[PDB]
Write a protein that binds this DNA or RNA. Structure first.
Length: 59
DNA sequence: AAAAAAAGAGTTGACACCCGGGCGAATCCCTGCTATAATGGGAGCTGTCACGGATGC
């Protein structure tokens, strides 16, 4: 926890909250999984319904 | 020879409105807490000299 909580604050070079970075990681993971087990590339339209988030937020 | 008014000023009410300041509500950032066992690290030159200087017995 100490190594992961501090790596996302100083190494990023810009102020990025923890929830933002965790959402980015989850989105990247789900996008990679969908691109690997669904088709050629996951579109941002279906990423909102897959994660149950608004389109303006995922965009 | 005389003698009053469209403008020119001056206001007086009458809206049209346009950001400001609150009331909300909806939502960001921080911080800590997770209980099987985790126990010393990965590049990098190394195919230029030559000078001019800094350590050692």
């Amino acid at each position: 926890q100490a190594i992961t909580r501090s790596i996302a604050d100083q190494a990023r070079t810009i102020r990025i909250p923890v929830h933002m970075i965790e959402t980015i990681n989850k989105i990247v993971r789900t996008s990679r999984q969908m691109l690997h087990e669904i088709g050629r590339e996951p579109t941002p339209e279906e990423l909102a319904e897959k994660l149950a988030m608004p389109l303006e937020k995922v965009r």
